Amino acid sequence: AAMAKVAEEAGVYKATKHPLKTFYLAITAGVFISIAFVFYITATTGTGAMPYGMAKLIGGICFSLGLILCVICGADLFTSTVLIVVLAKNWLNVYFGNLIGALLFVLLMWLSGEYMTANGQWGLNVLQTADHKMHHTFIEAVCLGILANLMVCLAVWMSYSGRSLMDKAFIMVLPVAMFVASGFEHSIANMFMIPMGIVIRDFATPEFWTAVGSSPESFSHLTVMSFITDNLIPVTIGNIIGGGLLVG
Template structure:
């Protein structure tokens, strides 16, 4: 005579992705954690993230150097895929990146943190990202990495940075919005992940897309444009002879132009694209007290 075994309840498979509402709650929890992180810890994590994004840009520049014979789209796709390394390092190794920290607006909208906590976190992370990026700039200059490929890598740094100072204010803001819309979607999708592989897989496509399309990321530019300014100012005469240009050809690569024509408008756009178009949008759908479409009995 056989005895029947009790039926176990069906639970979510460990490899199933976390669903959107739970992702929103996770984003809220992450925002609370970030806002309550002691500032020395947040600063170090931000410095790390600034360096990681710079490493992604180094990879991008090296891979896209000498690809003029390839179709435009293929070159940009290759560059975007390798640039994804930066956000992968941030997501897997740990780091506070300003462009994803704007998602703390979810925690603020849910009244889990104060405005002061939010702005304090943004300030520390932004400063830390800049310090980390500048430390990497120093290392690249000391290594004279811009001499690679007979100076072609250095020319790519200069040309890419130069192009980023040719926007008007509204264009730079729009490019910043589009960029961080994609970056924060990538980060948001990692909230559904249950493994390292999951995180890598969801990060690469949106990051590749924003890079290939020429959208603007303020932290990446904190590395690239200062590096190009320093190359213009300190590269020896032999470098300019090698690449066939002069420092005067890049005279508009200045700190003031960097701040006014790129960093300020792109930062504003990044805040809007990530905080409003991603964070607050999903907060409205999943976390506000009366969800859209609900009705009281």
């Protein structure tokens, strides 16, 4: 009894300044969403000959780890809440902190050697997963953002009816799996994925490219500039509309 509800009241929201503590909960969320994406990449590595949809579904289930970590630990994920029924200066704080968390996990994943796993296939999986996010028209990217954050917010929202750990965790699997297998776009998730792809594209050894049968040229859209303009901006706009789409 009691120990459990102690740990999860300390997980929750909406004292505005002190930030810093908010900035640190948001770094935490960036690390959790980065975990989700690494899990996804691990599970879908080598699944090129499975049925498309089945691979993606399993990657999706695995990814829900990230959001579970955010809700049970009480980290602060950009616009993931909006069970704020009783703003934007605070959003900037969370966003920038999400970003730092994600970039810290990129650095750590890079230092681990993991791109070489499965004879380079893990790294190529990152290269292709990131590259596929790079070819949307602006309207597409905004719409895929709308869809992703819709699902994240509904997941979080259901979580509240939760009484047990089981309830709060597992009610989030299906909607999270749904957006991730469907390839909807979440901006914070992308702050890990596309950077991770950029780092791999720029610092992979000649050996890696031989092993995987590609070259850094095959991935010409993975650049910080292109990332910001072609993905991050229109996706982020899309996530805002997405999380807002419900309220109205």
